[PDB]
Amino acid sequence: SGFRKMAFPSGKVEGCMVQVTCGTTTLNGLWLDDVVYCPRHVICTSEDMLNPNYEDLLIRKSNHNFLVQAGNVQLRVIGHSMQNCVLKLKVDTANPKTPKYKFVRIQPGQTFSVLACYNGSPSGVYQCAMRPNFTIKGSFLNGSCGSVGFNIDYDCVSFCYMHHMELPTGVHAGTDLEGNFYGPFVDRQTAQAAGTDTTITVNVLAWLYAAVINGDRWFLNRFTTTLNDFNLVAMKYNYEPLTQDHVDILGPLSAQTGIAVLDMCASLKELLQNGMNGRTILGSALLEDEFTPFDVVRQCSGVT
Amino acid sequence: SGFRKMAFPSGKVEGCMVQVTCGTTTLNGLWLDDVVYCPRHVICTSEDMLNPNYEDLLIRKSNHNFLVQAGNVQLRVIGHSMQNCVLKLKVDTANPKTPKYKFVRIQPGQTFSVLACYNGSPSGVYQCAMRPNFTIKGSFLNGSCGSVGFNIDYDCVSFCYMHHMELPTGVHAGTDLEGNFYGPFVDRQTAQAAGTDTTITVNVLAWLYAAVINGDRWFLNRFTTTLNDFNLVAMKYNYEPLTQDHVDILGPLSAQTGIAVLDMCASLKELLQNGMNGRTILGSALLEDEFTPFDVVRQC
Numbered sequence A: 001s002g003f004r005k006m007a008f009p010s011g012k013v014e015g016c017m018v019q020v021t022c023g024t025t026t027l028n029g030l031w032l033d034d035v036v037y038c039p040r041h042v043i044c045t046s047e048d049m050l051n052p053n054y055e056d057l058l059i060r061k062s063n064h065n066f067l068v069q070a071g072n073v074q075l076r077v078i079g080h081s082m083q084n085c086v087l088k089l090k091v092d093t094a095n096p097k098t099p100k101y102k103f104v105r106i107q108p109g110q111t112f113s114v115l116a117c118y119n120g121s122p123s124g125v126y127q128c129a130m131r132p133n134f135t136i137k138g139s140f141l142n143g144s145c146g147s148v149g150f151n152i153d154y155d156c157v158s159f160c161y162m163h164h165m166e167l168p169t170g171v172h173a174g175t176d177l178e179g180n181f182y183g184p185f186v187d188r189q190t191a192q193a194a195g196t197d198t199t200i201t202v203n204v205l206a207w208l209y210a211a212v213i214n215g216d217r218w219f220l221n222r223f224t225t226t227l228n229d230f231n232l233v234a235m236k237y238n239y240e241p242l243t244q245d246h247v248d249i250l251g252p253l254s255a256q257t258g259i260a261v262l263d264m265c266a267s268l269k270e271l272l273q274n275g276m277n278g279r280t281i282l283g284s285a286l287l288e289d290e291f292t293p294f295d296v297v298r299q300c301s302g303v304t
Numbered sequence B: 001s002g003f004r005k006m007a008f009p010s011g012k013v014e015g016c017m018v019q020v021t022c023g024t025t026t027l028n029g030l031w032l033d034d035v036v037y038c039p040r041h042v043i044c045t046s047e048d049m050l051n052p053n054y055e056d057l058l059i060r061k062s063n064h065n066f067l068v069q070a071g072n073v074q075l076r077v078i079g080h081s082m083q084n085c086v087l088k089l090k091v092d093t094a095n096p097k098t099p100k101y102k103f104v105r106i107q108p109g110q111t112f113s114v115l116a117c118y119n120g121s122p123s124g125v126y127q128c129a130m131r132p133n134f135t136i137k138g139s140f141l142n143g144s145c146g147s148v149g150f151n152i153d154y155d156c157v158s159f160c161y162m163h164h165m166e167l168p169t170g171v172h173a174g175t176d177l178e179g180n181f182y183g184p185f186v187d188r189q190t191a192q193a194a195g196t197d198t199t200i201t202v203n204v205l206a207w208l209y210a211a212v213i214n215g216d217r218w219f220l221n222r223f224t225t226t227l228n229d230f231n232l233v234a235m236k237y238n239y240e241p242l243t244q245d246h247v248d249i250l251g252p253l254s255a256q257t258g259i260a261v262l263d264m265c266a267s268l269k270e271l272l273q274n275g276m277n278g279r280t281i282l283g284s285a286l287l288e289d290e291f292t293p294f295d296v297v298r299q300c
């Protein structure tokens, strides 16, 4: 037993990380088959970053403008193109450590593992949720751009995130591996802020189930409720609307614990009014919203 | 910026995990060079749980009684010895993915990454601290025994923990890779219980230093404290005593932020008295004690 925030094992991704340099800028790249993926902002000087014309700045560059290093070994760049906000560097060598992989775009509320990297060197791994406001609450310093987020399904890595920038509030923004931003953000030095965030309701409920399953039961009660009554409380507390699809995805946990969702909503309802004033559920004084139902079942069943 | 419970990248350890079977019991082993390390209790049957005589159980085993599997490949065992509570299976192949590694015993307060594994297959990775009562608060199900705890400093893997059991309170007990238990625990199913746990004060202070580095100042105060008055107060909340060692260790974070260690102690004394009054620190509503002074500097 026990319940921890757990990343996927990062080894299939560690084998793909490289250093990419263009002028004075070094950041990370993702080496899959014979292509290196990195943020297009690698091409920009500080002056360019204010109002970049990526079309123009890139035709001006050539293959030899890009240094790619896999450990101590230089990769030869034999071509370059841009897809949305991602740069694709064609290299002369297929990565012999390329895993079974897909590029996937994740939905807000879904979780993934971040492999934080510096100078092409894996530094740490942690779990994030894609927030409703399309930011992530990561831990990133200068040099971390090009660090990726992923899930693992059996032996298949699903790459879903590439790190691009920090916003003024200290939260993080990036693209999918096709270079489409999550959220209404641009890759330039201009005024940009995160939207007011909201709490991921179905994940909070998942985590209350995780708590019950681990012998934390104090918050529970005899009552129940309606989607309609709860949602009016949720909107008041800046929680996402709970939908029939959400209630359905929590099915296994309602079953395993004997506590129905609108049962737990009643518990959750009661918790929103009052505050848990330093009091604790699974070692937290906050209502945790970065575990998905799948995260709770996966962890409380030992999937490998 | 940002601050997260961050595990070491697990790849170097992933390439070392195998499946050991003895009798009807399967658990994880660690394959370094020509040796597979696993908990000795893999040789116990139903009766051998309360009072196993491991010397007598092991002498009755031949190499062929141990089924070791690395992915699809069966590894052939050619030798066995016991060291303390760890079984060492000599095999006919050296692991070609063996990283640069060492075995280190940690002290209470130290942090490490756990690679949770089932049937020799890694499941996930997370950060733990060795608690002051010599337990860890992990996430471990049946089949997780032989999962390991590690640090990776400058390309060398330091193994510090191998998982043996869950105690009745739902906390976890294990050994170093020399097979010595952390704390008073034994590899018997006789009733055992952890000491009252306490908070790792030096780590809470390191985390308040992280908060200040990341631009939080709301919890600071105009007061200071003597070390002794700090300990007389902190022990009333089941905090570990802070030693001069701890004060020395926080010197670098003190210098970077310009807040003296005993001034930060006065903020912690106030937070214990007041709580957070609806505020958070680095996204927590609790005082966090599983980041070391070293983890704070690594991450900031």
Ligand SMILES: NC(=S)c1ccc2c(c1)OCO2
Binding pocket: B041, B042, B044, B048, B049, B050, B052, B145, B164, B165, B166, B186, B187, B188, B189
């Ligand atoms: N003979 C012991 S102490 C033992 C045997 C098997 C075990 C275990 C402990 O924890 C889960 O699996």
Ligand SMILES: [Cl-]
Binding pocket: B105, B106, B107, B110
């Ligand atoms: Cl130590």
Ligand code: NA
Binding pocket: A220, A221, A222, A223, A224, A262, A263, A264, A266, A267
């Ligand atoms: Na209820």
